[PDB]
């Protein structure tokens, strides 16, 4: 994705990894279409929560803009209002 967005995610990485429950978010992103069954497997294949979060973000970093937006919308639909707000500035300008 755009370097700006990547920078935003990296700017709030530790902030995300402490609060995010991967299950619901990954449900959303899979529904949107920016997360495969394999990737979901290798994320869910982690024993603790923070590890799953870490892996998930680590994967999103390699993806594109629409992935970032899907992730933001996931955060926003699942009650993570302030984290979504944290990612709001990094949302790629549309065209």
């Amino acid at each position: 994705m755009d370097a700006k967005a990547r920078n935003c995610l990296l700017q709030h990485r530790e902030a995300l990894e402490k609060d995010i429950k991967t299950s619901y978010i990954m449900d959303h992103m899979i529904s949107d279409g920016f997360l495969t069954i394999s990737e979901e497997e290798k994320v869910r294949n982690e024993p603790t929560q923070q590890q799953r979060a870490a892996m998930l973000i680590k994967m999103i970093l390699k993806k594109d803009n629409d992935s970032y937006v899907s992730f933001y919308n996931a955060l926003l639909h699942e009650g993570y209002k302030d984290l979504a707000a944290l990612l709001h500035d990094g949302i790629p300008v549309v065209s």
């Binding site: 299950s23 899979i30 529904s31």
Partner: protein, 103 residues
């Protein structure tokens, strides 16, 4: 004849609606009697996650992709059997829609 990409894609697309609406409380026996899984597999799908309905449903539709070509409509039939006519009709009409459009 493994499950075609249209079906897997259809399961992944409405993954949310499935892990939300799907009642698994009665599904198991019908899943067994229509030969989608075997008992120990059902045990696995039931133990998955925390054991909540959502986690169970999720693991179910995740494992459903591996059960062959006709695994999806068979599954739909199960939904029809447990009185989930609504969700079933949704999935069925959407699959029928998907099949009639290509490329």
């Amino acid at each position: 004849a493994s499950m075609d990409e249209a079906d897997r894609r259809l399961l992944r697309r409405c993954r949310l609606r499935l892990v939300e609406e799907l009642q698994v409380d009665q599904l198991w026996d019908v899943l067994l009697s229509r030969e989608l899984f075997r008992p120990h597999m059902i045990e696995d799908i039931q133990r998955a996650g925390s054991g909540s309905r959502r986690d169970q449903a999720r693991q179910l539709i995740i494992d459903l992709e591996t059960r062959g070509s006709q695994a999806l409509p068979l599954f739909i039939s199960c939904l029809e059997d447990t009185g989930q006519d609504m969700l079933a009709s949704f999935l069925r009409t959407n699959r029928q829609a998907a099949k009639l459009s290509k490329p």
